[PDB]
């Protein structure tokens, strides 16, 4: 029994991989704003 | 941008899809004509037939 709706399922689940991939994405961006931080705020210290 | 790319594979593949079925749609014109000629030929003696 083929599926019923190939080609949508496909799009759906590469939508939720690229979801993912741009919430953890952003998590990159914030840890290392966080990095730039530490070093700033140790050397005022 | 992985959007696109999906759209463009899928264009690609639907294109080679419909030059087969052109392919296809060839084939059977071809035939249909080969049939056609004998046709005609059967028409044409039957007159003579008649």
Same mark, same amino acid.
């Given at each position: 029994?083929?599926?019923?709706?190939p080609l949508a399922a496909l799009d759906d689940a590469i939508s939720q991989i690229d979801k993912f991939?741009?919430?953890?994405?952003?998590?990159?961006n914030r840890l290392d704003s966080?990095?730039?931080?530490?070093?700033?705020?140790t050397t005022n210290l | 941008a992985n959007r696109?790319?999906?759209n463009?594979?899928? &264009?690609?593949?639907?294109?080679? /899809?419909?030059?087969?079925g052109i392919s296809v749609a060839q084939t059977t014109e071809g035939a &249909?004509?080969?049939i056609?000629? /004998?046709?005609?030929?059967?028409?044409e003696l039957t007159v003579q037939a008649s």
């Open positions: 029994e083929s599926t019923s709706d991939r741009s919430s953890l994405g952003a998590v990159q966080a990095v730039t931080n530490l070093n700033n705020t | 696109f790319t999906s463009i594979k899928g &264009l690609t593949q639907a294109a080679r /899809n419909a030059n087969d &249909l004509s080969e056609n000629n /004998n046709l005609q030929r059967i028409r």
